[PDB]
Amino acid sequence: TQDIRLWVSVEDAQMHTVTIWLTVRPDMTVASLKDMVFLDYGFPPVLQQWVIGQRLARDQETLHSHGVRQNGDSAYLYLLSA
Amino acid sequence: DKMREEGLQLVSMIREGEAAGACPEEIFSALQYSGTEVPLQWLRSELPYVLEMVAELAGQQDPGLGAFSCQEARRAWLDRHGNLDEAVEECVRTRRRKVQELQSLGFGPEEGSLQALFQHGGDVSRALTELQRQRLEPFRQRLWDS
Numbered sequence A: 001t002q003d004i005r006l007w008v009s010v011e012d013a014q015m016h017t018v019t020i021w022l023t024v025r026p027d028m029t030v031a032s033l034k035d036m037v038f039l040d041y042g043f044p045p046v047l048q049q050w051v052i053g054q055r056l057a058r059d060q061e062t063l064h065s066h067g068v069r070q071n072g073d074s075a076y077l078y079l080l081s082a
Numbered sequence B: 001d002k003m004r005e006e007g008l009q010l011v012s013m014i015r016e017g018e019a020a021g022a023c024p025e026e027i028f029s030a031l032q033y034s035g036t037e038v039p040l041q042w043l044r045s046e047l048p049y050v051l052e053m054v055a056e057l058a059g060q061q062d063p064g065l066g067a068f069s070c071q072e073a074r075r076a077w078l079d080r081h082g083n084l085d086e087a088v089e090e091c092v093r094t095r096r097r098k099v100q101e102l103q104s105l106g107f108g109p110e111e112g113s114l115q116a117l118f119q120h121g122g123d124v125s126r127a128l129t130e131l132q133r134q135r136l137e138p139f140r141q142r143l144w145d146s
Helices: A030-041 B004-011 B023-033 B038-045 B051-062 B068-077 B085-105 B112-121 B124-136 B137-144
Strands: A003-014 A018-024 A046-050 A074-079
Touching: A003 A030, A018 A030, A018 B051, A030 A046, A030 B124, A046 B068, A074 B124, A074 B137, B004 B023, B023 B038, B023 B068, B051 B085, B068 B085, B085 B112, B085 B124, B112 B124
Parallel strands: A003 A074
Antiparallel strands: A003 A018, A046 A074
């Protein structure tokens, strides 16, 4: 499975929403998704909570298992703090 | 360790007449990463003008596209087998296409499209990340705030 542009809404405890695009693979795990966000954006995996295909996403689950499949599919990232 | 082996190859790109497109920045960085340092201006004056020419020419041909990077110049240059009027034309073509990709991903020139592209060697993913990272910074900061 090849590269997919993913439309992500990012929120935290308080703020405003912001939306970003990420490159993923449907066979990527959430753990790998989180590691990538850490590496690029500096958000510890531990403070990352994801909802994908209307369900909370766990570390060992693939994006595929949450129905990710095509460019413009969406996902939701919520950030805890300190 | 894998970065050393890249530094070696990057540095080899200036032996006595090594047909190639050395980019002064890359070599300069390879040395910083290594632990020394060499004046950046001195590298510029050691290498041919070729790749900067390609870049200046592309900038002349469409100033609407901002500054061209050495990596984008080299790319077009290699693709056209050292043919210099052909490198310019493809260098512009490749950059135009990219500006509207960023546009259609929500970043036109008025939003820093052009500088991020230059700054990241015409690499869209990396421009995009950089650009998205500037705007996500408040969120990053809040992780450590309260």
